[PDB]
Amino acid sequence: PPGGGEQEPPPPPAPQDVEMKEEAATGGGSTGEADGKTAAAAAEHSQRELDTVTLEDIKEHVKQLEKAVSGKEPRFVLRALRMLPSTSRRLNHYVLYKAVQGFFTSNNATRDFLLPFLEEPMDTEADLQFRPRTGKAASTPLLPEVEAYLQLLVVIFMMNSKRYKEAQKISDDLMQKISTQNRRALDLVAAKCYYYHARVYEFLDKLDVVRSFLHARLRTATLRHDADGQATLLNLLLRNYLHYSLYDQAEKLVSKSVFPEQANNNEWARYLYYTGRIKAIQLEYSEARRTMTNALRKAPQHTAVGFKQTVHKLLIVVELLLGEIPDRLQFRQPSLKRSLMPYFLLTQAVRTGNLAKFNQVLDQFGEKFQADGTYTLIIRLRHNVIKTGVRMISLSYSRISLADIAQKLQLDSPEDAEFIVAKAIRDGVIEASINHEKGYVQSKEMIDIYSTREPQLAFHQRISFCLDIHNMSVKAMRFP
Amino acid sequence: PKNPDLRIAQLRFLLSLPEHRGDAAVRDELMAAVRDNNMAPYYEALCKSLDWQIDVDLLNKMKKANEDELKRLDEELEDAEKNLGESEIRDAMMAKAEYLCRIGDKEGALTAFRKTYDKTVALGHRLDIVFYLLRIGLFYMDNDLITRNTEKAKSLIEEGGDWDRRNRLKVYQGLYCVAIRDFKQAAELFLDTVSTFTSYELMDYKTFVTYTVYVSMIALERPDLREKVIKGAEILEVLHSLPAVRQYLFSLYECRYSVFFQSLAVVEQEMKKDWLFAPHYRYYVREMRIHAYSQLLESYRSLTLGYMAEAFGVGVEFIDQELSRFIAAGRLHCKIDKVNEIVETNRPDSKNWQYQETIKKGDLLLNRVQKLSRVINM
């Protein structure tokens, strides 16, 4: 008891400092950044806010409860106040409440007091200049609080932050005018709590009412604030719309646009994983392997944790349907390994041309196939076994009888033996010629050609268009 | 001061991988445990191998008496430093504590290595230290510390010059290149052959002869192979003593394929029971397939398999499934025809592969620059 009682005081001071000065220096600094320059945007505290939010998402967040200085909620949410020279007095009032909190119990517990608190900014009337400061002062307690998952009486409080964000959405439909240099930070912050829309709604069932609401927000941002807005909202669309049918494959067709410019960073890569599974549902394997590889290869630096391992998991699925895959056991991480353990023997069965080896993988690992969600291609891969199996033996064997190859091709009668190779040439597999009497399959090859034209002529536009973009970057980054 | 414990580490490999030896491996382990008075090594061996019965007071009084031999040295260091004689003090405590660390783990070892690092003015004692990191790295199969001691020693050795100990290091780096997969550097650094003679750090000289003659058949060219074994004057006798590998050498040049898999069976059986050769045999075998079949097909562009089947015993339908299944694996790709009786070699791949490295390397090259291009800025 004395140890646990005296170890309570040490923890709070760290949130009492960094959690106090995180939105004070970044948010209060963004106030001066939003007064001037305006360049145009930047607003580097918006990306610094991303660093602080992602910092809280690990440790320590805020609430929950923690029983440490719950008076931080009324601190920033009250006392604009009101015009800038009067706000300076309230900038001293934060220090006044620092002394009040340094004297008495400092209101270490709020809970049901969030009802007057969250409505106090509406009692001030008003900030009135910066809506992102009002939305952030209310959300910063509540957004990390969603990670508690208590599911009692505070879920509707998260919904109240969603209503405050809807007031942020109506103001996202009006002012402008003109260059709402704060709406990019509103795109950032709202995309977060739009994913908190996803989490809080997923506590019970699908959000479908918010699918029409997301389409209302996604379409009302057109065309003005779509920049960096439409990208995050399209992932908010694509993610759960990939979980719930339907039509998103043809919906993103008419939705594009592209939509440029890609922001922010890994956002477009993960979008190419989301739409990567989409474009993989059309089964064209050149665009699917390029969108899946570009999804993972374009994503630094992690941690955390396993979904960046999931894009790598589903990445080589289209490579399994290509007919040739390397053994990936050397790419296993300490985490991704234990997650894909069935998928290991799966791609090992894809390398081999044995049917029973692949079918036993299906019967045993079908439970993990339910966990991943990819099924339909597991039964049709038997056609990849007959095409890779015939690619194997044909190129392999000098002249193979249709009765001897019939074991690995499982039928290979005297009739279909013609089509196996012939319709493989239709798919561009093997050139083997067969004169059918008994018969026997005599595989030869003569090709000397290509390896030339498209690679070098494309490399011209590749390199040139690249260095042109690198011009568009460097030439435009010299403002300082 | 190595081979007794080197055999213990070899006995660890004899216990670990094969599960079918329950008698001789533990017997001679105890025969080597009752000597050198090992403590920490028999703890790891106690968990892997049998838990006895009882050790307890036996090796505890042996570690108590060795502690008296440990405490007579560790209480002599303050009595020796009472006098002054530069080395006439610390050289006794650096070598004997490494013998006291030979009793267990890395502790006295690493702490004496950096201890004496600031004292010895001669490279011979520094290389003896290097020998201690190499033996303790060989027992625990740790390749991290065997690179650093040699990298620091060679600068002092190559400043520089040596005869014997330079050939010793060539055997070391040859054992490290063969510990991981390096085919060329093993035989190239073992080209010294008999000039190393026999040493306690080189263990059995016949085993070293088998190490260089087993690794010289892969990455070395066929004219260079017979130039090493046949033209080599000193290496020819020591490889002649064992007919097992010598039969594989002269029959590989004789091109006869009827003795190959039997001679390779004896070679592979020796490859299985030797340490550090376990990961490398899987590629080593199929490499000997494409090695012997490279001179099989190169005889004639269009070859009649009837002439192949003349003396095989029997190669009529065997080379069909044999070579084919090796072609499907990726070893010696060729297009062969039957009932036309044409084995066509080929395929030079002088067109696709000639220009393929451009687009191939350029794929991942331009990919890796596409990452760094589209990541920044934003």
Binding site: V53, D57, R239, T303, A304, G306, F307 | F261
Partner: peptide, 24 residues
């Protein structure tokens, strides 16, 4: 990051090759 997506969630062969001789 921690932002965006990720926080959501013929043998060798020895015996058989030696046996091919004495098989036939």
């Amino acid at each position: 990051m921690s932002e965006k997506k990720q926080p959501v969630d013929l043998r060798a062969e020895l015996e058989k090759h030696g046996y091919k001789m004495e098989t036939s």
